[PDB]
């Protein structure tokens, strides 16, 4: 019965693996989608660097 607690762990880990492969792959792709979001949020910050720059300089070209 101390051994059956190990056979139950080996039987439950096989059942677990059927959600665990999806949980791993979903949490991989949700990290990877946050990672493609964070590179694309730094692209929104580059396009904000151009927006604060054209706000500062191109407005003073119109003053020019």
């Amino acid at each position: 019965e101390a051994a059956n607690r190990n056979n139950d762990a080996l039987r439950q880990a096989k059942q677990e693996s059927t959600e665990y492969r999806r949980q791993v792959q979903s949490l991989t792709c949700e990290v990877d989608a946050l990672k493609g979001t964070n590179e694309s949020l730094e692209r929104q910050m580059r396009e904000m660097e151009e927006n604060f720059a054209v706000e500062a300089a191109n407005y003073q070209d119109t003053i020019g």
Binding site: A3, N4, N7, D8, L10, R11
Partner: peptide, 20 residues
């Protein structure tokens, strides 16, 4: 459908544990 296949696999898991 994945739960029903897990109910099938679960009898043989609990059996091969107990049969040790």
């Amino acid at each position: 459908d994945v739960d029903n296949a897990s109910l099938a696999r679960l009898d043989l898991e609990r059996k091969v544990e107990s049969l040790q």
